[PDB]
Design an enzyme around this catalytic site. Structure first.
Site, PDB file in Angstrom:
ATOM      1  N   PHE A  60       0.816  -1.215   0.000  1.00 48.31           N
ATOM      2  CA  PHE A  60       0.000   0.000   0.000  1.00 48.31           C
ATOM      3  C   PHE A  60       0.842   1.253   0.000  1.00 48.31           C
ATOM      4  O   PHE A  60       0.939   1.947  -0.975  1.00 48.31           O
ATOM      5  CB  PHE A  60      -0.966  -0.065   1.223  1.00 48.31           C
ATOM      6  CG  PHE A  60      -1.931   1.067   1.378  1.00 48.31           C
ATOM      7  CD1 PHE A  60      -2.198   2.015   0.400  1.00 48.31           C
ATOM      8  CD2 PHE A  60      -2.621   1.188   2.584  1.00 48.31           C
ATOM      9  CE1 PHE A  60      -3.099   3.017   0.573  1.00 48.31           C
ATOM     10  CE2 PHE A  60      -3.496   2.205   2.762  1.00 48.31           C
ATOM     11  CZ  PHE A  60      -3.761   3.134   1.824  1.00 48.31           C
ATOM     12  N   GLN A  63       3.889   6.026   5.288  1.00 47.53           N
ATOM     13  CA  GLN A  63       3.429   7.354   5.667  1.00 47.53           C
ATOM     14  C   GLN A  63       4.329   7.939   6.731  1.00 47.53           C
ATOM     15  O   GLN A  63       4.740   7.228   7.666  1.00 47.53           O
ATOM     16  CB  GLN A  63       2.019   7.327   6.226  1.00 47.53           C
ATOM     17  CG  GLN A  63       1.453   8.702   6.551  1.00 47.53           C
ATOM     18  CD  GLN A  63      -0.051   8.729   6.785  1.00 47.53           C
ATOM     19  OE1 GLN A  63      -0.755   7.893   6.254  1.00 47.53           O
ATOM     20  NE2 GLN A  63      -0.525   9.596   7.638  1.00 47.53           N
TER      21      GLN A  63
END
Ligand SMILES: Nc1cccnc1Cl
Length: 165
Positions: A60, A63
Site C-alpha cells: 500500500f 506514511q
C-alpha cells in the site's frame, strides 16, 4: 523552471539504510511542492529531519511527516496548521507516487505518503505532488519493516534530508 529535487537519508533503528530522492512537481502543484521542499531543508525552523515513518503497510504505502506528535495525529505546513487542496491534476498511478495525507477536505499539513502500489481510489481526494526519482530499492527495503496494521517492527527515521542540485 526545473522541478526541484529533495532527498531523505533513511535509518533503521539508527543504522543507515540508504537515500531516497524525489522530484517535486512544482510546475503543476507549486504551493504543495514548496511546502514539502521547505520542510525537507528545514529553512522555516521546522520540518522532517529526525522524524519517523510511523505507518507502513506493505502493498500500500509508507506514511510519515508527523514531526509534532510522531504518530499520525500532528504536523503543520509552512503556511499554517493546514492548507487547502491545491488541485487534483496528478493521479495515484503506481509505486513511488508522493501524495499528501489528510483528515478531510482542505486539511493538508506536513504528513505525506509514498505509494508502494497503485491507489487510484485516492484520486481527487489526496493531492499528488511528486515521485521517487532515485532509491525505490530503499523504499522497498523500508516497506519490509511494516505490517498489515501499519506498525513497524523497527524504527524507520529520516536521519537527514535536504535539497539536491
Ligand atoms: N492532522 C492530520 C493531517 C494530515 C493527515 N492526517 C491528520 Cl490526522
Amino acid at each position: 523552471m526545473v522541478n526541484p529535487t529533495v532527498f531523505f537519508d533513511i535509518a533503521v533503528d539508527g543504522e543507515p539504510l540508504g537515500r531516497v530522492s524525489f522530484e517535486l512537481f512544482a510546475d503543476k502543484v507549486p504551493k504543495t511542492a514548496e511546502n514539502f521542499r521547505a520542510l525537507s531543508t528545514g529553512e522555516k525552523g521546522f520540518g522532517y529531519k529526525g522524524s519517523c515513518f510511523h505507518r507502513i503497510i506493505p502493498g500500500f504505502m509508507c506514511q510519515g511527516g508527523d514531526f509534532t506528535r510522531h504518530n499520525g495525529t500532528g504536523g503543520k505546513s509552512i503556511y499554517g496548521e493546514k492548507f487547502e487542496d491545491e488541485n487534483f491534476i496528478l493521479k495515484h498511478t503506481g509505486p513511488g507516487i508522493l501524495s499528501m495525507a489528510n483528515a478531510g477536505p482542505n486539511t493538508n499539513g506536513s504528513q505525506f505518503f509514498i505509494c508502494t502500489a497503485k491507489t487510484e481510489w485516492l484520486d481527487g481526494k489526496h493531492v499528488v505532488f511528486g515521485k521517487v526519482k532515485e532509491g525505490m530499492n530503499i523504499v522497498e527495503a523500508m516497506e519490509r519493516f511494516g505490517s498489515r496494521n501499519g506498525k513497524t517492527s523497527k524504527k524507520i527515521t529520516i536521519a537527514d534530508c535536504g535539497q539536491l542540485e
